[PDB]
Amino acid sequence: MRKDGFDLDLTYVTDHVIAMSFPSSGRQSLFRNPIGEVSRFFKTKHPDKFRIYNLCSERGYDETKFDNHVYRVMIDDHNVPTLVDLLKFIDDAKVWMTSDPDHVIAIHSKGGKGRTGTLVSSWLLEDGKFDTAKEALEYFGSRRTDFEVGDVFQGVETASQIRYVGYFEKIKKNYGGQLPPMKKLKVTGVTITAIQGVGRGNGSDLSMQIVSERQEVLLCKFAEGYNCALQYDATDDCVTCEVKNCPVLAGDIKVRFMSTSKSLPRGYDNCPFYFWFNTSLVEGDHVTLKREEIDNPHKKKTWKIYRDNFTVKLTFSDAE
Ligand SMILES: [Cl-]
Ligand SMILES: [Cl-]
Ligand SMILES: [Cl-]
8 A cells, every 4th residue: 555645735926826636645545535524624723714616527527515615607617718607707706705805715726737828828817917828827837847948838728728717808908807608600610731751741531520519520531522522732842621500609619530541649628729719709600720739739749741831721610
């Protein structure tokens, strides 16, 4: 049985904003579901000071029980909260932080990085500490790593996480802190540039899944023409796919690309590359994401595969 133990990692982002995590378990530990007991300690030994936010996956949410002093947010590892849930979090934090100058918010997630960073950086924007998502993200990265070099990827883990902090910035600045109006869209096309070196280099290994919040709503398989029609353009080093039968989409959308190619590595989320967007913040008839704006190609270790001009564009139709 060698070594067990409780390793509570606590990082003061500001004097009243804490990021907490438990980096050490491990495997079979006596300390199962530590949040309940950390909460119990706070309400006993430091009453009416700390409010804990527990950020956990769909599966991990089931293991939790309601707590008066704990606010739960459902977010999958290497993913983002719904924009609605992000705004609800900000509202709850605002109420807690403003009611008493001594009040502290403590944000917890398993890895103490991507999910925590998304919410902490959004909070820093709400409290006016920074004017831009980039500044907030870099600052949190610097606090959690104790390292000076400003890197947004030290603050969060994925490009969608960076996007969602940006979404909050836009909501605060341009929408009066309110959720933007619903926008209904259908995906009618996908275009991928710099396809050479990516799987088979011609799109024939690829499939695309569209997920609405947590439910698959469309699957396209490119080579086969399953809900689609693939065209490979060698002269422009790109693939374009007509997307067929897309249902009406609204709100938070996840797009995942899968491959039958052994040579194309999976990153996070059990796939080669993926991204999140919100339909309400789509401008025009498309969204185009560059290499470092896509989840997985954002990592330098994949740059021999996803080259400088690798981009993914979704083309939309207006659904009333
Ligand atoms: Cl419950
Ligand atoms: Cl792999
Ligand atoms: Cl239509």
